[PDB]
Amino acid sequence: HMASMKKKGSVVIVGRINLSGDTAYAQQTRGEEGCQETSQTGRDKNQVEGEVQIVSTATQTFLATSINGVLWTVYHGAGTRTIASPKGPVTQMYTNVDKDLVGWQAPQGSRSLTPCTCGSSDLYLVTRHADVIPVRRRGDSRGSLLSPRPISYLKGSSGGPLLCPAGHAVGIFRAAVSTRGVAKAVAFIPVESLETTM
Ligand SMILES: COc1ccc2nc(C)c(O[C@@H]3C[C@H]4C(=O)N[C@]5(C(=O)NS(=O)(=O)C6(C)CC6)C[C@H]5/C=C\CCCCC[C@H](NC(=O)[C@@H](NC(C)=O)C(C)(C)C)C(=O)N4C3)nc2c1
Ligand SMILES: [Zn+2]
Numbered sequence: 584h585m586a587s588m589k590k591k592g593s594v595v596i597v598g599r600i601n602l603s604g605d606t607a608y609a610q611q612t613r614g615e616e617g618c619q620e621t622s623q624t625g626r627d628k629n630q631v632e633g634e635v636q637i638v639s640t641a642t643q644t645f646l647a648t649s650i651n652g653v654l655w656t657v658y659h660g661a662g663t664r665t666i667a668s669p670k671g672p673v674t675q676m677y678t679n680v681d682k683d684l685v686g687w688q689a690p691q692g693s694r695s696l697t698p699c700t701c702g703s704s705d706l707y708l709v710t711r712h713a714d715v716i717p718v719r720r721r722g723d724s725r726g727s728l729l730s731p732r733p734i735s736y737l738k739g740s741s742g743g744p745l746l747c748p749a750g751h752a753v754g755i756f757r758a759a760v761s762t763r764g765v766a767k768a769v770a771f772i773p774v775e776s777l778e779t780t781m
Pocket of ligand 1: 643644645646658659660680681682683734735737738739740741756757758759760761762770
């Protein structure tokens with residue numbers, strides 16, 4: 584009934600993929616209880632750093648990537664949810680279920696990736712475990728793993744970046760192409776598609 588209708592919580596930044604030095608590594612910045620509490624209030628006072636965030640809802644965890652001052656992720660992870668911030672929940676400024684894409688204004692303190700204009704097909708996929716996986720671009724929205732891996736290793740990395748050799752953003756990881764449980768290829772949202780949405 585109306586009086587007891589619940590509200591969905593916010594997406595909460597719970598960590599990041601550190602790409603600042605020579606070694607990529609995941610960092611947790613918030614534990615499960617603080618995540619639950621922050622999801623309900625929408626108030627996250629933690630300092631944000633870096634380009635790739637680890638984000639969570641009450642039921643899912645995935646990645647989000649800052650490009651051109653927008654923190655982007657997948658609709659199948661975030662739905663229409665707000666994201667927690669120091670002054671309360673922030674409404675999405677982009678939502679496109681047809682592209683599996685959402686975006687919020689980039690958090691204060693984040694750093695943004697630059698959209699790639701290299702036209703290169705030698706890409707690198709960054710996972711939630713800070714693996715950097717070589718991927719050969721095979722089409723507008725597809726690339727093949729040079730070393731296929733069980734889908735277990737990619738689960739939870741939607742919303743992460745595919746990068747060019749120079750570290751520019753080429754796309755947002757959306758889905759895995761699975762044959763008998765092995766990811767041989769990935770699908771991504773091309774950065775051009777983000778730029779058109781903006
Ligand atoms: C609800 O509104 C929308 C709107 C648009 C939309 N667009 C979509 C393309 C879409 O896909 C669904 C989600 C997406 C997905 O799991 N992504 C991540 C990920 O990590 N998620 S996650 O864990 O972070 C999470 C779950 C918390 C958030 C990267 C993959 C990592 C590992 C793969 C695990 C096995 C799933 C294999 C799926 N692959 C296939 O279905 C392909 N078919 C075969 C046979 O292979 C293709 C892609 C069909 C060819 C697949 O990757 N999926 C299914 N859902 C939506 C929904
Ligand atoms: Zn580039």
